């Protein structure tokens, strides 16, 4: 009844601070001595944010206690040569019973972990400067960029699931856009705002959050109806976990009764439209 749970910092879903008090919960982080050793120190941190508030509600509703820790090998979860790292890895290799955070439900992961119902919608979205007109990832402007002059300047953050999806579904688009690879989201926002980039293709929940709080409300996302590969963030559990049904029912109860919306208002909804 007391559970090992893993998370990962990604504001505003999981925000990590030094030590707890207030709306925070304790979370430990194994911090390495250097990059040539496995030796390290457990450090006390405090965690808060959208997914942490969900966890607090689940612990209460589903009646469990937990020890929360931050993942240290990789991020959300990537399968390299059939070996998982990140939060998915922690669950797969039974170091955690549950993973909580901005964790995208997909087929590859669902083969090795169980997911709860989605608690936040996401997928592949597009962000542009206000005034630019595109429909979504499947727009011909993206699929056949040289059909236009000048061609659209657009990129994503490489090496993750967004790139992988585009590579699989739109091979020419993938080939074209690598020249506009962005190091991270923050770099991409600046590129858009300074006219160095026309569109940034990325995770919908993240782009919605960034657009919601952009300074001057100059950045815009497509409508949710044009999100490609719609899915959600979900809680990952061990395959055949006894906790899945009650976690599923609780999340559906939270959504149905307005609790999820007030969490969204609290953490995700920005001043812009």
């Amino acid at each position: 009844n007391h559970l090992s749970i893993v998370t990962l910092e990604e504001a505003p879903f999981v925000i990590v601070e030094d030590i707890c008090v207030r709306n925070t919960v304790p979370c430990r982080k194994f911090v390495k001595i250097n990059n040539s050793t496995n030796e390290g120190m457990n450090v006390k941190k405090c965690c808060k944010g959208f997914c942490i508030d969900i966890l607090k509600k689940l612990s209460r509703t589903v009646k469990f206690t937990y020890d929360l820790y931050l993942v240290t090998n990789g991020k959300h979860g990537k399968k390299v040569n059939n070996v998982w790292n990140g939060m998915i890895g922690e669950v797969v290799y039974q170091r955690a019973v549950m993973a909580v955070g901005s964790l995208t439900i997909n087929e590859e992961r669902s083969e090795v972990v169980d997911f709860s119902v989605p608690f936040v919608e996401t997928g592949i979205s597009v962000m542009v400067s206000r005034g630019t007109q595109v429909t979504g990832l499947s727009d011909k402007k993206f699929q056949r960029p040289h059909d236009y002059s000048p061609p659209f300047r657009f990129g994503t953050v490489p090496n993750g699931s967004t790139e992988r999806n585009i590579r699989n579904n739109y091979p020419y688009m993938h080939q074209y856009m690598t020249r506009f690879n962005q190091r991270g989201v923050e770099d991409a926002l600046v590129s858009l705002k300074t006219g160095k980039l026309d569109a940034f293709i990325y995770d919908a929940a993240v782009l919605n959050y960034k657009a919601g709080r952009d300074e001057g409300c100059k950045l815009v996302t497509i409508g949710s109806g044009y999100i490609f590969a719609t899915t959600g963030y979900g809680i990952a559990l061990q395959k055949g976990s006894p906790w899945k049904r009650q976690i599923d029912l609780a999340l559906l109860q939270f959504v149905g009764d307005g609790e999820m919306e007030e969490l969204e208002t609290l953490w995700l909804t920005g001043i812009c439209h």
Binding site: V117, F228, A229, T230, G256, D257
Partner: protein, 272 residues
């Protein structure tokens, strides 16, 4: 085996048309050249022709998981809510009742995933994300769910949803909707088509329903418009009994289909 599939009439997810005289389904293509795959579905019973988003999905699921099927329309015409008997007993009506009683093995329809139903059945991961909105006739002007004509109701302005649907449940269960619910329960309709026709004939002034359906209706019938905004987000899922041997692979198939652009194709063919 051979799975019994229950569905319901609900364009653009399920269209229902007469067979040709020889009992087959007429061959038809979309405006952009896509074949329209049709299956025989029995219903209120007479063999008929069914096609649309949910039918294309069923055919994909069938091929992927190698099952066969026979499709029928829900006998009572309802989605499914749980109601008291006579008794201390409760009973599900609609597609929910048919799944639970064994008259169907799978529900393939725009069935909203909610806590009430998930207590009793298993839902796949969502095959479609959408929400609730409001449909009115052009010339009717409301701000949406918080308009005073909704939050402060009278019989001068009539609004409603479909009986024995998830939307009915959504309004019954929340204390802060208690005033709205009391108005609606005097006016709810037997089906979405009837409520939509009623809005066109100025007999219903606002219809609260699934945005995937309402936005489609508004895009075909220029005398109808929606609020625009969703006031609640929800998903449609495939429904199975909790002992179903198919449930894991149905969900994986749905996730696979979102990721490989199959659902994108269905959205463009049927929903956009």
């Amino acid at each position: 085996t051979r799975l019994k599939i229950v569905t319901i009439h609900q364009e653009p997810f399920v269209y229902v048309k007469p067979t040709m005289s020889d009992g087959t389904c007429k061959e038809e293509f979309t405006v952009n050249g896509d074949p329209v795959k049709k299956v025989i579905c029995t219903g209120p019973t007479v063999p008929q022709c069914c096609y649309g988003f949910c039918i294309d999905l069923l055919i994909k699921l069938a091929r992927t998981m190698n099952f066969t099927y026979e499709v029928h329309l829900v006998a009572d015409g309802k989605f499914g809510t749980q109601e008291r008997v006579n008794s201390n007993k409760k009973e599900w009506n609609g597609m929910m009742g048919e799944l639970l009683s064994g008259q169907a093995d799978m529900i393939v329809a725009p069935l909203t995933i909610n806590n009430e139903r998930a207590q009793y059945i298993e839902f796949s991961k969502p095959f479609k994300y959408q929400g609730l909105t409001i449909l009115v006739k052009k010339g009717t002007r409301i701000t949406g769910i918080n308009d005073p004509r909704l939050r402060n109701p009278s019989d001068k302005f009539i609004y409603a949803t479909v009986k024995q649907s998830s939307v009915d449940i959504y309004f019954r269960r929340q204390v802060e909707l208690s005033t709205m619910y009391r108005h609606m329960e005097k006016h709810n309709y037997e089906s979405a088509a009837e409520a939509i026709q009623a809005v066109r004939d100025n007999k219903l002034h606002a219809f609260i329903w699934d945005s995937a359906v309402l936005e489609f209706e508004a895009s075909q019938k220029c005398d109808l418009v929606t609020t625009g905004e969703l006031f609640f987000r929800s998903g449609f899922g495939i429904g199975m009994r909790k002992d179903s041997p198919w449930k894991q692979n149905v969900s994986l198939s749905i996730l696979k289909s979102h990721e490989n652009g199959f659902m994108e194709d269905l959205d463009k063919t049927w929903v956009r």
